[PDB]
Amino acid sequence: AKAKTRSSRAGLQFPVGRVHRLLRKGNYAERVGAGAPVYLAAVLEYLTAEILELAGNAARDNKKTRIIPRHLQLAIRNDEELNKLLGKVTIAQGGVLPNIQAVLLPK
Amino acid sequence: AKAKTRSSRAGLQFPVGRVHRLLRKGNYAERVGAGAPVYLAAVLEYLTAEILELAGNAARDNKKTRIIPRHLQLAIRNDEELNKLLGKVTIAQGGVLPNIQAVLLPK
Amino acid sequence: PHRYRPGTVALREIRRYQKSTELLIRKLPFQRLVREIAQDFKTDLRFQSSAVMALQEASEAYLVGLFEDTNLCAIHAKRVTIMPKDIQLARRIRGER
Amino acid sequence: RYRPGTVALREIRRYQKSTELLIRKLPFQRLVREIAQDFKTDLRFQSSAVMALQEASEAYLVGLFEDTNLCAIHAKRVTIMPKDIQLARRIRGER
Amino acid sequence: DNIQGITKPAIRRLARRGGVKRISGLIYEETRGVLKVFLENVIRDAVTYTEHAKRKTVTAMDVVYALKRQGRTLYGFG
Amino acid sequence: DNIQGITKPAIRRLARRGGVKRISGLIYEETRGVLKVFLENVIRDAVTYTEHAKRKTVTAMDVVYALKRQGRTLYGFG
Amino acid sequence: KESYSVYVYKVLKQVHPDTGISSKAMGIMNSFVNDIFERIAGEASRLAHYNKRSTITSREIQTAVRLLLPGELAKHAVSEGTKAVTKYTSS
Amino acid sequence: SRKESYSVYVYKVLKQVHPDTGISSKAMGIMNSFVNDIFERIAGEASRLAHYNKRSTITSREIQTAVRLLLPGELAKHAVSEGTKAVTKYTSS
Amino acid sequence: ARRRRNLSEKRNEEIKMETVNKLLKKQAPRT
Amino acid sequence: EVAQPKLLNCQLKEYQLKGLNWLVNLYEQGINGILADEMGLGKTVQSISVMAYLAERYDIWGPFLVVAPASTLHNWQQEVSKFVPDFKVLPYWGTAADRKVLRKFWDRKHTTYKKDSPFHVMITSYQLVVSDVAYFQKMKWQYMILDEAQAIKSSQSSRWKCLLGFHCRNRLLLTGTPIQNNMQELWALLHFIMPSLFDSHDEFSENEDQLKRLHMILKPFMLRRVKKHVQKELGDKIEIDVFCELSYRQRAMYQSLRNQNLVMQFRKVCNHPDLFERADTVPSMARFVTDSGKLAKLDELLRELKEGGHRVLLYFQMTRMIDLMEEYLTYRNYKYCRLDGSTKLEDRRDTVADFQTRPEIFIFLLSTRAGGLGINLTTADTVIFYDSDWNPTIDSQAMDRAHRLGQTKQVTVYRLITRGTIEERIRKRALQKEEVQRVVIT
DNA sequence: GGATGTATATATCTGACACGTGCCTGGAGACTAGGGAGTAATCCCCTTGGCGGTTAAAACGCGGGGGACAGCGCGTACGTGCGTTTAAGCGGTGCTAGAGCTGTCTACGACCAATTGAGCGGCCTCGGCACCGGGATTCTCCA
DNA sequence: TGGAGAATCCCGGTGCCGAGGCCGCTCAATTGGTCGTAGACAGCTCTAGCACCGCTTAAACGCACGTACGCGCTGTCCCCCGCGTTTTAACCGCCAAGGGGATTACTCCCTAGTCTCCAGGCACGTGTCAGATATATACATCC
Ligand SMILES: Nc1ncnc2c1ncn2[C@@H]1O[C@H](COP(=O)(O)OP(=O)(O)O)[C@@H](O)[C@H]1O
């Protein structure tokens, strides 16, 4: 019988089988649900999409064709909710959001 | 042939067997070395002693025979190395180390 | 006749309350506040007793630590009085906002 | 040219636009090998490991300066001074 | 309402334990907002653990686990 | 004496990225002390992982772990 | 040695069909996904343990997302989760 | 029924360091909490160390590297010593 | 020791010289 | 005066031999200089012969550097391999991954090479001499030829600023059109030759007497020669101007623009309407041919030449007009080849060989700037310039690609001019400039 | 009447992606076992609520005092720019330590069954502590 | 310095409740055995990191200078502290209902486990094309 990737059965560009391997072998529990990897893979795909959508936008606002680490930084630190999720994270080659205190600026 | 607790077999007050049970049921990994629980039990006993020695001293310095939470709190915040181990920890019923900032004191 | 000068009584207070273990918010009104927040999230929530005691230990421990930080922000600005701008600085440096 | 101060704010609008590493590579590397050899003699490093340390190290210092800046401004100064570093560290919890 | 159940005298005391000599007058309303925003975050997590266990009763353990999801670890209740 | 290899120019650039307009002169010797204390802590951990794996070479991965041990997660290197 | 590279590119070609993504930015995405997997599977792990249960089901994942992701991001993720598991079960 | 806890063992340690001293239930509750917390951390660290080396077993060596990572300074030295001693005695016996 | 190290130089030299020549052959000579 | 180099695998003609004598005397005096022979007298084999003479007498077996334009590199590789076959000749072109590997020939320690050494002559483009100057600056070049040297006429160019700082003994310029534009460009060549003497913009600036002045002043630094005195065996260029009148479509667009900065837009209309906007509401090929006066008049002329058994070099200034022209040649079912500056440097070799090897091919389409330099096309007979260049040296360079040595048929130059339009203005100015250049040499 | 900026071309090169062959290892399908989680019935404990009472503390009202604040002078530190000096960055050659992979086999830890004593629940109990009244001693404050 | 006087600590006597000891008993820790794979080990290839050399040229350094910030000092006036009195609701000790969590049994379906098979994805080549830098020329503009 022709094999149909679990991914395709659940419409998920993310690889549901690999997620099931890593949950099973990585000692998170004794037994893993068949529904576990499908749900978790849906959530990874959704977060991946969100960051790339915001970074894509920042690329085109800078008039450039290719996403780079500077744009991932600019994406992640604009969104209130993603910044709360990645507050501890340093992104290599990302640089800083432009920021001057209004006290420093000219009178 | 007569039983010898693994604890006695290894000169320790903390329970080597129970530690081997928890390392097995805690999904910390697939196979759990034999000496692992013996070494882990030795360190738990050491840290337990270190705190209770300090607490005993704090209790005697306040003329009382029973350790209470407030004595643990004093003991733990008065030693730099224990404080660096437990900085994020709150102890219930602990209170605060007595510290008034010197510029607040009267002229 | 007698009055202590402004501040002596406050330092009496610092010694006394820095030397007590007891909980500083009154129990019954704190308990009542915790259910007012809980009833937004799920209706008819029975609380254990020790759960509200644990919330109160955490709540007092958080604020008493916040005042320590706040006080350093004041003293650095060459004031002795803490003011709302001090609290907001402390929270921002600790990353909460 | 520029009124007194406009030049500092131009420095700001420069270095916030760039993404480059701000410490010089070889001096950084020598500091890392000096510190390392206390813990173990004959430690070989991978290029990428020293670059990791430098990215993290600059990220840490830059972030300390933002927190230091807020301490100054709160004291109605524009100048950061050692007291401001020390205050930020204690609040953040690096005592 | 209930947030005003945290009395001005109460805050004054808390502050004293943190060794503050002179307290403003606008501190009090700010402190209440701070304490509510803390409690809302902890309670949401505690109630979320309670509902996953299909209990109706928030236990001490739910709270203790809620707090360890915030870098604030409480010793002496479970 | 390699810590003085972190030049005054450089500390000043870092400050500028952090949006500082004017810097005291005493800032330079504090900033050096700060940087060394942070690197000592991370390198000690990285070498601790390296020796555990019975390597002699400190890899990128050791360092990235050593930083996630301390709540400083470095995205970009394995 | 494996990476989630392939899949990130597929998501990108679907959300922004003209764009590409540099080698170093792809390395950042591979870092991000490994990080979040660990966080969610760790919370699921602990939830199971706290409840004396031996399987990480899909219910354990959903409570772990509700705990990790802040605010509206959570709502959207749990919706996406639920949709997909429904579709898979319907096969 | 049968919840289980380390209070028994804490009493013995206290009796060896301070023969006349005792301990309130609340203080013992704190001690019971402390011990779980530290087991958790040292086991978790040892877990991840094994994973990063692509190994299946948590041996004594891993618990050593974990003590050396969590504990600061002189604490660490003095603990890694107690550990060596104990495992040496067991291997002997 | 010495034999393997000596052989490495010959093995390197052979490939280096051939790959050097191949590139001149890549450009000048028609391909 | 000097004997022919014994390593040289071909006989020098009398004027070539005298040229080698001049260059040898320059080297032994320590003076740098310009061989300025009119195009196709054989500067190359004279240049090569100095490398031979140095390698014989003073045992200076390299390293020697030829810098040349891209079209021309393959020519030099062949010429050196043919005329002095003992020399070992190293390309320095191609991708960065290639060029790294080639640097592994260079010996940085022996300052003067000998016969056993890895390479004797290196051939590289102007373009790589600029991009890779960082690496070149380490070498100790023993003799250096810049070929097609008006490449360096602009003193403000990065190229001049780079090549001035190449560490080397004797330099030779080759350029068959030394005199170009204003006297500042003549300064630039002179300074590149001898910096100490020609150190100042202003002093070189310091009128019939000034012109007579200059002729003597240049006599120690330049040798100029012209075809009619030595190539008497090859007849002069027959030059035939052809006029064309704008098509109705052209006329409409030109009036539209004139009613509506527009210099280059006028030049486009005169080439072909379709260089603005092509066509389809259906567009016929017959309309395409008829819609441009030039192309229409060209169609007559091509058909005649085909019937007669001639072969054509056809030059353009605009690259999109090469694209359009291929379509008309495709439809008229003529076999053609194409070479322009966008063409990869491998294919250059192949294409030129093809047109010189297999006379089925009727037309070579060439860009004027890429095609004008280096390539040798003796098998052609007819040159057509579809559009006028502002600079007369560039067209000169171009038509001399048909009028080399070893040409045996009467070279015929056609040139098409669109009457009453910018084309005329341009050819007018180019002829003024050619009179000035010709006077200054004269 | 000249020095320069602007606009539009060609000529080239370098690095990003699209496609390609190849090959291989892990994901898919399919078949069985047995134990975890799901079901309901039970039960006792601990939470929610009402009551009546005491009294600690919160709530309100005043002075007045000393701190937050605004302003000013002034003085020395910090920024600047010009000129010089030194090391960083490049790119090389070149050696070899050691990371990373393969193939063995042995020794060790998962798994089972039988035993038995450690440690839990529960019950009894008496001594450490809280608190209270009193006195003696210590800190503030103002004349 | 000197009394005043409110507060604090220390002494002492009561009494109460929870720390601490001892009794059954059940279940998990110990003993002795099997066995099968993890990983310690020996050996190998070859990546890549450590040394060391010369050159350009940029940033690092040093100095002379000046002006703007920091900050020490004063006058004002608001607002917090300290205290007193009234008011109110928290705390206590108690009785009760009853819901809801912890438990015991029991059954069934889900997931681990093994096997067979093949296509997804990883590594390495390559080629081709849009973007970036030079450079040429006219002409308008600014000087
Ligand atoms: N003795 C000779 N034998 C063969 N070809 C010769 C000889 N002398 C001159 N030539 C020709 O001289 C031509 C080169 O002319 P030259 O002016 O040097 O070229 P360019 O104008 O491109 O610099 C070649 O086509 C070559 O065939």
Residue numbers in the entry:
A (entry chain S), B (entry chain O): 12 to 118
C (entry chain Q): 38 to 134
D (entry chain M): 40 to 134
E (entry chain R), F (entry chain N): 24 to 101
G (entry chain T): 34 to 124
H (entry chain P): 32 to 124
I (entry chain H): 389 to 419
J (entry chain G): 961 to 1166, 1183 to 1236, 1259 to 1279, 1542 to 1702
What does the publication say?
INO80 is a >1-megadalton chromatin remodeler that is conserved from yeast to human and emerges as a central multisubunit enzyme complex that determines chromatin structure around NDRs/NFRs. The Ino80 polypeptide itself carries the core ATPase motor activity and acts as a scaffold for the three modules. The A-module is highly conserved in evolution and contains an HSA (helicase-SANT–associated) domain (Ino80HSA) in the middle of the Ino80p polypeptide chain, along with actin (Act1), Arp4, Arp8, Ies4, and Taf14. The INO80 remodeler specifically places nucleosomes at the boundary of gene regulatory elements, which is proposed to be the result of an ATP-dependent nucleosome sliding activity that is regulated by extranucleosomal DNA features.
To reveal how the A-module could chemomechanically communicate with the C-module, we recorded and analyzed various datasets of CtINO80ΔN bound to 0N80 nucleosomes in the absence and presence of the ATP analog ADP∙BeFx. We first focused on the motor domain to see what effects ATP binding have on the way Ino80motor interacts with DNA. Comparing the nucleotide-free with the ADP∙BeFx bound state, we observe a conformational transition in Ino80motor that is very similar to what has been described for Snf2 and ISWI bound to the nucleosomes. Upon transitioning from ADP∙BeFx to the apo conformation, a step that could resemble ATP hydrolysis and ADP + Pi release, extranucleosomal DNA is rotated and pulled toward the nucleosome, consistent with one part of a translocation step. In the ADP∙BeFx dataset, we were not able to identify an equivalent subset of particles with well-defined arrangements of A- and C-modules. The absence of the post-HSA domain density may suggest a more dynamic mutual orientation of A- and C-modules. From sterically considerations, the different angle of entry DNA at the motor in the ADP∙BeFx state may not allow mutual binding of the A-module to DNA along with a linear HSA/post-HSA domain between A-module and motor. In our structures, we observed that switching Ino80motor from apo to nucleotide-bound states affects the interaction of the post-HSA with the N-lobe, a feature that could be intimately linked to remodeling.
